[PDB]
């Protein structure tokens, strides 16, 4: 129960294609929101918001929903607005086991 | 017969901060709504150092 840091830079799109695949497996829990923002934002302005032609979000410093929380009520597709929200609640269970 | 400036009872049996604990550390819980993420957690582990 280490939280993780992320670390990239925002001019390889590849590296943000492959963090989509991070966010979605491990839960947001872990990575720290000082940099699971700059990650989740960067994947918003760059691949989501662009390929529907949406004019690329304002996101101040500090606002208490994640850019991934805010763009499932402003997008309206259904199946790129389906995988935000299982980023937005993918979560630890905390079972008791033995 | 000397007039001397004298301070109240609450501050020389120290329970006055105890009253600034609770001061502190609900400062402590609160979510600085517009501040940056990573000036809030430098902000709130420095008021648990005290």
Redo the contacts between chains.
């Keep these: 129960q280490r939280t993780m840091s992320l670390d990239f830079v925002t001019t390889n799109y590849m590296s943000l294609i492959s963090g989509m695949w991070l966010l979605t497996v491990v839960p947001n829990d872990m990575f720290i929101?000082?940099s699971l923002?700059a990650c989740q934002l960067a994947i918003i302005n760059t691949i989501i918001y662009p390929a529907f032609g949406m004019q690329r979000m304002h996101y101040?410093?500090?606002?208490?929903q994640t850019p991934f929380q805010i763009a499932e009520q402003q997008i309206q597709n259904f199946q790129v607005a389906n995988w935000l929200h299982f980023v937005n609640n993918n979560q630890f269970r905390q079972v008791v086991i033995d | 017969g000397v007039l001397n400036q004298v301070l109240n009872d609450n501050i020389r049996n120290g329970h006055v901060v105890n009253q600034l604990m609770e001061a502190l550390m609900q400062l402590s819980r609160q979510q600085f709504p517009t501040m940056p993420v990573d000036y809030k957690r430098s902000i709130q582990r420095g008021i648990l150092l005290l």
């Design positions: 929101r000082e923002v101040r410093n500090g606002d208490p």
